[PDB]
Design a protein around this nucleic acid. Structure first.
Lengths: 48, 159, 186, 166
RNA sequence: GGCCGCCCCUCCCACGGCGCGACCGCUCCGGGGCGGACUGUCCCCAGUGCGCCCCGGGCGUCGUCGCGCCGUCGGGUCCC
RNA sequence: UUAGAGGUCUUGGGGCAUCUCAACCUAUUCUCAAACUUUAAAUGGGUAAGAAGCCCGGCUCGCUGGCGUGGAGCCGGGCG
RNA sequence: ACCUGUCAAACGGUAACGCAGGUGUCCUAAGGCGAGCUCAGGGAGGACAGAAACCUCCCGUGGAGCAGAAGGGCAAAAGCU
RNA sequence: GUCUACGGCCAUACCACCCUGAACGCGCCCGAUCUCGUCUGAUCUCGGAAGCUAAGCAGGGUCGGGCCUGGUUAGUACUUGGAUGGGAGACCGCCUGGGAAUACCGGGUGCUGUAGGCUU
């Protein structure tokens, strides 16, 4: 440590940007989901 | 008559704002005050040391002394028909920089540089502020659409 | 209409309160000079001829030598609207051309023995009607005893003004208010 | 939509008895220290808000070319060495205002009317006009113009009032 | 000498109006293929927005650029 | 501080396997506060709108200090 | 002679034998510093134990405490040990 | 695309529940000889590296509560200045300027600084 304390930074590597997390849903997706959830409830209660 | 107590009538002026109690944010202690700059005095009840008197809350003065935790300020106070420059020591928590001075210092900078640009370009530029002039003459297009006719509405007695 | 009159009349001397006919003749002379000449020197001299004795303090010989030794002041006439007094703490007097209303006998002897010249204000008008090549001097106006008593009151914290005291000693206004051991000391 | 006017003529229509301290201050800044005194005011947001303070005390509007002509010619005086001097010759104007380019009564009228550079100097040179009482009377000095009174901004009707007071 | 007074004219500028293109920015009431999430009609189902990707339409205070045409007791010491 | 409504553990009561009340909870609802408040005016109060300013170069310090640090002071110069 | 809230009209100041109250003390710690903890209350459990003894988990923005009245302030606090 | 150490602004960041988490890391985790502290190695302190993302933590979701922001409420309430306005009064209208707050209805649900990794 006393002879060579200088730090050599790990070289940065360019990589392909791959998403490992879910992106946020948009307003259109959120509104559509309620539309089809409502329709399924009406359809299921009508069938039974 | 009423009392001469130091904190009489400070029930609201020294209270913390709603949902803003607790630990004092640390950037207030990191603000740097030099000799000659203008500060707003606003007492905070969370810190009871170095507290300005209520008559200096909402007042603005300039720094004449800097100590370890406090600042000396020259503040104008009106006393029965005469204005005197009081010197008060206030801890750092109860003061903040005054943005009016910062705006003026910026305007001095853009003025000086506009003088240099004007001299180098051989032109003349306006540097004095002017009050809002009367509105200039202009045309208003109807776009082939008649103005909507407004009319007072009849009176109705609601609940 | 809708004005105030309490400051309409300016309070200043338009003539000497004195009845000294010789001063009245110099006022007649310098009234003409202030009017018919564009010199502001003649205007300043005219004002000082009107002024009272407390406003015309004596000018010490030492102070005039001090002010006439400053650079560029050589071969100029020192003008005093007042009395030139002798200073015994000065041992060497150079040659000076001094114009004054009054010069004390010992001052006049020392100035003349040094080779200098003393002029009156009528000879100053004949030599320099404009006031060219002059140094207009004045004695210390606040250098008298009444000003030690003026100002912030003695019994007020940061005041260094002299009280009106009949006699000076340990028993005369030194105990309470001038001492932390007797009441207070501000 | 025409450009909103740049020039106003303001006439004090009230006396000096029982005036509030703020209205008193604004009136002496407008140089209306006497009843039926008049002056030209350059219109901008600074001056307009001043005129709103003294609204019950003044009757103002937009003068025309004839109004500025009759006021300056008939009872226009200069402030020459702190004195009220009648404008009888063009030399009086040239000695005080000639450095700005105003050398005659026509230059001073153009300067006031087509308000521009050096309006401050030309207008301050003019002593506040001492108008007479309005011949034919007034409607109501204590009420605003839009309520059948006298005060406030009569925008173009000020020229009718000037014909009767000048 | 100059200007104005009536007639083909003539140039520039300003204001307003009418069209014609080009460029730019927002938008979808849009089309076509590439990856992610959604639905109790979920395998044969049905939708939802998102990236490149060029065509179509609209708006932009009525954007910028020019081009024409019409009006003015318009301006140019009343343009030549 | 007023009134209904929907549920239920009920050291609750009453009329008689019990059932209604009361209690509690939840979502609503009527009406209020000088010594209550999330919100929050109008009119108020303070400061600033340069030459005592701005921008360059240098010197001093026993204060501060990783440092050519920082802060203050002082000496020149330029810019209306 | 003093202090708290209000009066008091959103800077400060502002009166009445106006309103609601407190004071002539108390503390070797309840002064100072450090460390470690979290309080009131409630739910669910546990031999005697029950509406209130002590033990355990959970929720808890302070709804407790900080000696004196009241207002402000305060949570790995200024509270408890 | 993300994390860690130290932070700034302190909910657009909190709370409830569900889903997903590659690699580094952060953890949970194993143990008590030494340092250290306990009724109790639970916590604290220390020595580790068999297992695991179940939890914490991160990202997403919910016609979610809250929070932020905008409409509406509404030129309403209130208010500077004015009148020899009205009204028996209580109070109200007008001129001249300023101008809110619930309920109700939408949109959003951390940004970022220094240093050091992973995404090879």
């Amino acid at each position: 440590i006393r002879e060579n304390p200088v730090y050599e930074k790990k070289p940065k590597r360019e990589v392909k940007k791959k998403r490992w997390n879910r992106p946020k849903m948009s307003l259109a997706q959120k509104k559509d989901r309620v539309a089809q959830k409502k329709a399924s409830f009406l359809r299921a209660q009508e069938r039974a | 008559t009423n009392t001469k107590g130091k904190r009489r009538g400070t029930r609201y002026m020294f209270s913390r704002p709603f949902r803003k109690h607790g630990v004092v944010p640390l950037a207030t202690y990191m603000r740097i005050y030099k000799k000659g700059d203008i500060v707003d005095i606003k007492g905070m009840g969370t810190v009871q040391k170095g507290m300005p008197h209520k008559c200096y809350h909402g007042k603005t003065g300039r720094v004449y002394n800097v100590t370890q935790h406090a600042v000396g300020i020259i503040v104008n106070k009106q006393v029965k028909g005469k204005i005197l420059a009081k010197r008060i020591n206030v801890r750092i928590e109860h003061i903040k920089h005054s943005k009016s001075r910062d705006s003026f210092l910026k305007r001095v900078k853009e003025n000086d540089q506009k003088k240099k640009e004007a001299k180098e370009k051989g032109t003349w530029v306006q540097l004095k502020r002017q009050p809002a002039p009367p509105r200039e003459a202009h045309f208003v297009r109807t776009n082939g659409k008649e103005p909507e006719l407004l009319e007072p509405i009849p009176y109705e007695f609601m609940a | 209409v809708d004005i105030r009159h309490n400051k309409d009349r300016k309070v200043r001397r338009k003539e000497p309160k004195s009845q000294d006919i010789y001063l009245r003749l110099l006022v007649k002379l310098y009234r003409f000079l202030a009017r018919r000449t564009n010199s502001t020197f003649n205007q300043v001299v005219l004002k000082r001829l009107f002024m009272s004795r407390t406003n015309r303090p004596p000018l010490s010989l030492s102070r005039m030598i001090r002010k006439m030794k400053l650079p560029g002041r050589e071969n100029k006439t020192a003008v005093v609207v007042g009395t030139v007094t002798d200073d015994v703490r000065i041992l060497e007097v150079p040659k000076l051309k001094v114009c004054a209303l009054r010069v004390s006998s010992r001052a006049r002897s020392r100035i003349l023995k040094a080779g200098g010249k003393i002029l009156t204000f009528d000879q100053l008008a004949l030599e320099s009607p404009k006031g060219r090549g002059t140094v207009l001097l004045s004695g210390p106006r606040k250098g008298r005893e009444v000003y030690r008593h003026f100002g912030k009151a003695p019994g007020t914290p940061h005041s260094h003004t002299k009280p009106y005291v009949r006699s000076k000693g340990r028993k005369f206004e030194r105990a309470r208010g001038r001492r932390a051991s007797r009441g207070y000391k501000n | 939509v025409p450009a909103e006017p740049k020039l106003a003529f303001v006439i004090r229509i009230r006396g000096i008895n029982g005036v509030s301290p703020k209205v008193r201050k604004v009136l002496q800044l407008l140089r209306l220290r006497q009843i039926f005194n008049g002056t030209f005011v350059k219109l901008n947001k600074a001056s307009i808000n001043m005129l709103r303070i003294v609204e019950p005390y003044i009757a103002w509007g937009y003068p025309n070319l004839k109004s500025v002509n009759e006021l300056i010619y008939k009872r226009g005086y200069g402030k020459i060495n702190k004195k009220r001097i009648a404008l009888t010759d063009n030399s009086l104007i040239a000695r005080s205002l000639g450095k700005f380019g105003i050398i005659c009564m026509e230059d001073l009228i153009h300067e006031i009317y087509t308000v521009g550079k050096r309006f401050k100097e030309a207008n301050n040179f003019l002593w506040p006009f001492k108008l007479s009482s309005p011949r034919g009377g007034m409607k109501k000095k204590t009420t605003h113009f839009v309520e059948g009174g006298d005060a406030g901004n009569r925008e173009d009707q000020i020229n009718r009032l000037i014909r009767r007071m000048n």
